[PDB]
Amino acid sequence: LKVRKYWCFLLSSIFTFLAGLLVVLLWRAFAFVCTFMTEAKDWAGELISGQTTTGRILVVLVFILSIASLIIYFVDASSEEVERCQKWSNNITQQIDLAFNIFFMVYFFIRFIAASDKLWFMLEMYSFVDYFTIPPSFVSIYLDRTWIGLRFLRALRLMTVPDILQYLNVLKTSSSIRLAQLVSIFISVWLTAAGIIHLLENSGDPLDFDNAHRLSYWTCVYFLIVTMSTVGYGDVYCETVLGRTFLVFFLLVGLAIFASCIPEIIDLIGTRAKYGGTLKNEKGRRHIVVCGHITYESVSHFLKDFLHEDREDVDVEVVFLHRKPPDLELEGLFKRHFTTVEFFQGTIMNPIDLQRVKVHEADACLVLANKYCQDPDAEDAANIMRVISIKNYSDDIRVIIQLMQYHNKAYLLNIPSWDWKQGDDVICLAELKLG
Amino acid sequence: LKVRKYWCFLLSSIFTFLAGLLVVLLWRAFAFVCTFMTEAKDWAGELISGQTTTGRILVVLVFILSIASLIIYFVDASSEEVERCQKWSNNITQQIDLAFNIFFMVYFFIRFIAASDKLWFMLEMYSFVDYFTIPPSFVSIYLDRTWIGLRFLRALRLMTVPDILQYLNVLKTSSSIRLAQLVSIFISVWLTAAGIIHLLENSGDPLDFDNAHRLSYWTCVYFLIVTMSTVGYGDVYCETVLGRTFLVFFLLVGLAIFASCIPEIID
């Protein structure tokens, strides 16, 4: 009570460190001067990697129990007293805590077997975290006391989420893996460093423990987010010498962590998928699909002639399909024709995009050509391939295409599904211009 | 008076949400096992898009009444009491407020007709904003009380300016459209989030409402601009648990909003 035993919990933690370090170190030295082991190591490697279902349930089990162990901390940190004196029999949260640590103790041993280098496995962060949470829990039974100690290290489990879930094949695309990594580190650093300040501020200076800045754990969490954002209100601040000392390191380390992540946050957040989805509307009305050269003046000139007063009033919807996102001016043009013109992002050559815009039900597909092209041969070849893709999806579809040169008209006529008698038309600019 | 009815205003707002959500959801299910509608939907689409002059006057009318509705909030937020008990007959600002919400109620119905997907139209931000301002105003007649509630959401009208004015062909060049979009979002976020802090700080913690940090609305507006600029004087700060909790989300969301706009503010 009056005399605290915080050293007993702390000094026990490092006992498991150097003693465990030396036992593996000395055993290697014995073999220097003086089988199932190979099979067991290979079995342990695939067990912790989730290769098989017996290990797949194990890695997710670690995932479930990782967040769960943090829940015990949050109700423990709610108490104002950082040190408590109560027997195990009446305590509820302690009993649950015995169930977690023994599983993580045996799971730690399994990881040790799979490690090729025993010495470097001892000196990993995941090794350190169990060295500071498995021993003190057992000591709490002996000491009959409850101390917060270094219990915030359980938040370091959360950085396995991009790794554990990667073994489960849910993280396929590179964008998902990177963003999952970045988010998990930020949350874990935020939660772990908040626990350090909560312990340091409440405990006070060593050997006297008189200046105790009683602060709630969630107040500390609010304190760091103000600190990281560099706002610094000053309503909540560290007063203890130890708390300020850690805050100095946190400021330096935090920027260093941020600096290493600058190149990857730049090219990850600057993405957007604005246009997509399939064309779904009512039955009865008719629509056409326009592809090819889709620019601001290509659409505005087309829409002015298509939707004109002199033309007979017929309700035909215009659908545009281009692989590039429209600029600001083009989007405004689409808004002014919201009830008549719709846009989708995709390409004709992709059969998936053809089904989205409902090519098989459209009246005709119009292919616009880039008249001001450096290479007319290249432009014509690309446009011809679009007709092949359209005809591949459905042989009975009307296609109207602009061709820059007359000699390329022969290729279209050689298509087996091309039929001028059924509405297919070729408008050759070279033939018409010189005509 | 002693017992507050803030839940009555709040719980009524979500009543119009799930009930409205289920009615359109159940009607689709009925047709699964068991015309003027097409013409009406096409008419509604061009009405809200400003295609014709009858709809051109309507969209600008929404524009005029959008900023106007905010003026009522500013004089309501001036009062120190976030909850009031007064009859409609003597209250002036309430009577004006009845004139606005009924127009926005019928305008909301017009937007519903023009929507191709009824379910996703229910789950849009503009749908949510009316769900939190049209019901409580009608309840204030029944309850004979005045509460600020979630009234700051009317600042979310201001993000229609780059869209409504685009229908009016005043936004021609791409530079004007982009800068109008960026300015409108910043103003609306600044005004809306200031209202959240003003409501949270003045109301206090739930179920006890004892720790009430009485703060002026314009003081909160000055508080956020200091926060966004990362200056953080600390003279004005959030003390309630709920106010700090929202401030944590505002810091995270604000940088995320800023991050998405970095490539476009550069060029």
Ligand SMILES: COc1ccc2c3c4n(c2c1)[C@@H](C=C(C)C)OOC(C)(C)C[C@@H]4N1C(=O)[C@@H]2CCCN2C(=O)[C@]1(O)[C@H]3O
């Ligand atoms: C002044 O004191 C600090 C201390 C620590 C941090 C951290 C970040 N700042 C800190 C500022 C600041 C950086 C600035 C203002 C230059 O920005 O605030 C953010 C909210 C954007 C988080 C950022 N930060 C990261 O973006 C990365 C992403 C993965 C994990 N990250 C971190 O943990 C951290 O490095 C995080 O420690």
Ligand SMILES: COc1ccc2c3c4n(c2c1)[C@@H](C=C(C)C)OOC(C)(C)C[C@@H]4N1C(=O)[C@@H]2CCCN2C(=O)[C@]1(O)[C@H]3O
């Ligand atoms: C720390 O806490 C915050 C919280 C929110 C914001 C916001 C911005 N900062 C915030 C900082 C900071 C960003 C920094 C210091 C990295 O810069 O301060 C500005 C005054 C430049 C506004 C900026 N910001 C935007 O530039 C965009 C433009 C369109 C709408 N925007 C926003 O709403 C916001 O994202 C806005 O939320």
Ligand SMILES: CC(C)CCC[C@@H](C)[C@H]1CC[C@H]2[C@@H]3CC=C4C[C@@H](O)CC[C@]4(C)[C@H]3CC[C@]12C
């Ligand atoms: C090599 C790596 C693991 C660092 C090891 C040193 C760490 C784990 C040890 C060495 C000295 C220890 C500190 C000694 C004194 C105190 C003050 C007490 O009120 C809270 C615990 C606290 C804050 C201890 C935390 C853990 C600590 C910092």
Ligand SMILES: CC(C)CCC[C@@H](C)[C@H]1CC[C@H]2[C@@H]3CC=C4C[C@@H](O)CC[C@]4(C)[C@H]3CC[C@]12C
């Ligand atoms: C799904 C989207 C719309 C979010 C819905 C949840 C929102 C609208 C609801 C759920 C709980 C509600 C809060 C419950 C308690 C309080 C405290 C009171 O003093 C002010 C209102 C306030 C702050 C409410 C604001 C609105 C609120 C946050």
Ligand SMILES: [K+]
């Ligand atoms: K700063």
Ligand SMILES: [K+]
């Ligand atoms: K600052």
Ligand SMILES: [K+]
């Ligand atoms: K300060």
